[PDB]
Amino acid sequence: ASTLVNVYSDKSGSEASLLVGDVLVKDSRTLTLNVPAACEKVYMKYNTVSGTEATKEFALSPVSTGFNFETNRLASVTLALPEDAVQPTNETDQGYLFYHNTGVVMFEDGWPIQLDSWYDEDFNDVVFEYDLKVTECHSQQMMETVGGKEELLLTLDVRAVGGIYPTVLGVVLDGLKSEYVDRITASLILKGGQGTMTDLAKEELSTKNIVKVENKNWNWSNDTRKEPRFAILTVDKAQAEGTVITLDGLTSLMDNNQDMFQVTQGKVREGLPMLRAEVRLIGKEGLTGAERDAQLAAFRELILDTNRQNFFIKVNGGKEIHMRGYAPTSAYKAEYEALVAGDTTLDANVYYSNTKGSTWGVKLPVGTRHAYERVPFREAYPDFTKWVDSKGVSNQKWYENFVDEKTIRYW
Ligand SMILES: [Ca+2]
Ligand SMILES: [Ca+2]
Ligand SMILES: [Ca+2]
Ligand SMILES: [Ca+2]
């Protein structure tokens, strides 16, 4: 595996900035990557013939229908191995290529209600980090047609709940049909700040359409309350739109309605392990022809196409909120249509958006800090409206300009 390379969106070879891992580069290799919108170059880390690690910078090319709050873009890179690199042979290329995409999802819980200056909302009602890894479990890289299988590893980590009524967070893995998914592994975990993982529930390699794992009687070590908490992770691979993943139990994370969870100054719990949902989806083996190409594309497009990661939240009563331009689940579809029907403030042609192009959710770089309770998002991020109002043309790195006193970091 010493010849395989790692590609990052940052000079720092941080795990968060990894775009594609364990890549075989025989002569040259062109890859489509999902990169930060402002990103113009990528960094290939490689093993040298002396045993050290080196970095080579690569320029990005454009890949070729309006602005929709994307902090990412599609780009292309042509990798080439420098002459001092570990040269590939079957002795040094034993590794699976994997795509990587991570970010932080920030939701407002009030849909269909919003301030006219929608960015005056605090956007911390549900704050969760996600991490997606799609591994190509193939015997050899760079094939015309391929056997083996794909794997998907998703983590959903609850960072904060700045609302009284949010109950669920989830994602639709759009296009990831049941025909493509053989097994589901689903885990509820407490994610410690220094790499320690505590399992709350787990079901391994299930062939079920619906895998439900739950722990309805857990507490953090040295917890601030004696009352037990609960978490329910449901993986439904059999929905028409793709795999539907939900993490229920968000209401049990706070201690009271005034403070809520990880949002109120003086009440944030320092270094608190994060509630984590972890899902491993193992692709069907032995699928062939056109359908096999369709399967590999379905796993790949979840990382490549940002629009396939249909994140959402639920609030008490079952109301489902998605980001602008993202569809309700098939189950909520009828309710969504009945709800929006008489509302003059909502755009009838765009999902979950007011008539002035608002959103109730944003997907940001994973390190982006959320706002303190009732602090307007545009005050926590002074360059946000510049990016919004220029429709992503200016201040593409607006998320890097946060105001310390208006934002939280406890991890
Ligand atoms: Ca090989
Ligand atoms: Ca809010
Ligand atoms: Ca809030
Ligand atoms: Ca500070």
Residue-wise DSSP of 2-56 = TT-EEEESSSS--TTTEEEEEE--SSEEEEEEEEETT--EEEEEEEBTTS-EEEE
Measure 110 CA to ligand 4 centroid, in angstroms.
Answer: 28
Measure 181 CA to ligand 4 centroid, in angstroms.
Answer: 44
Are the CB atoms for 6 and 85 separated by under 8 Å?
A: no
Resolution of the model in angstroms: 2.1
Measure 161 CA to ligand 2 centroid, in angstroms.
Answer: 10
Two tokens, residue 163:
């609302």
Are the CB atoms for 244 and 277 separated by under 8 Å?
A: no
Ligand nearest to the CA of 164: 3
Ligand nearest to the CA of 402: 4
Quick count: other Cβ atoms within 10 Å of Cβ 231?
24
Q: Could you give the 3-state DSSP secondary structure of residue 370?
A: strand
Residues 6+ apart with CB under 8 A from 122: 108, 162, 263, 371, 372, 373, 374, 375, 376, 377, 380
Two tokens, residue 343:
């509302």
Measure 35 CA to ligand 2 centroid, in angstroms.
Answer: 29
Measure 155 CA to ligand 3 centroid, in angstroms.
Answer: 23
Are the CB atoms for 76 and 31 separated by under 8 Å?
A: yes
| Alpha-carbon radius of gyration of the chain | 22
Measure 306 CA to ligand 2 centroid, in angstroms.
Answer: 24
Q: Could you give the 3-state DSSP secondary structure of residue 148?
A: coil
Measure 403 CA to ligand 3 centroid, in angstroms.
Answer: 17
- Technique employed here was X-ray
Ligand nearest to the CA of 161: 3
Task: Give the ranges where 89-202 is alpha helix by DSSP (H).
Answer: none
Ligand nearest to the CA of 369: 4
Strands 126-137 and 149-160: antiparallel
Measured distance CA(174)–CA(380) in Å, rounded: 32
Measure 379 CA to ligand 2 centroid, in angstroms.
Answer: 14
Measured distance CA(131)–CA(104) in Å, rounded: 9
| H or E stretch at 152 | strand 149-160
Measure 262 CA to ligand 4 centroid, in angstroms.
Answer: 14
Measure 270 CA to ligand 4 centroid, in angstroms.
Answer: 13
Measure 164 CA to ligand 3 centroid, in angstroms.
Answer: 8
Q: Which residues of 298-323 are buried (b: 16+ CB within 10 A; e: fewer)?
A: bbbbbbbebebbbbbbbbeeebbbbb
Strands 149-160 and 5-8: unpaired
Measure 129 CA to ligand 4 centroid, in angstroms.
Answer: 21
Instruction: Give whole-number Cα distances, 238 to 84, 132, 225, 409, in Å.
Output: 49, 20, 38, 37
Are the CB atoms for 117 and 385 separated by under 8 Å?
A: no
In the chain, what is the straight-line distance between the N-terminal and C-terminal CA atoms, in Å?
A: 33
Q: Could you give the 3-state DSSP secondary structure of residue 388?
A: helix
Measure 258 CA to ligand 4 centroid, in angstroms.
Answer: 22
Measure 340 CA to ligand 1 centroid, in angstroms.
Answer: 54
Measured distance CA(326)–CA(125) in Å, rounded: 18
Measure 159 CA to ligand 4 centroid, in angstroms.
Answer: 17
Ligand nearest to the CA of 160: 3
Are the CB atoms for 211 and 234 separated by under 8 Å?
A: yes
Measure 407 CA to ligand 4 centroid, in angstroms.
Answer: 8
Two tokens, residue 261:
């969870």
Residue-level length of the chain: 411
Measure 360 CA to ligand 4 centroid, in angstroms.
Answer: 27
Ligand nearest to the CA of 404: 4
Ligand nearest to the CA of 409: 4
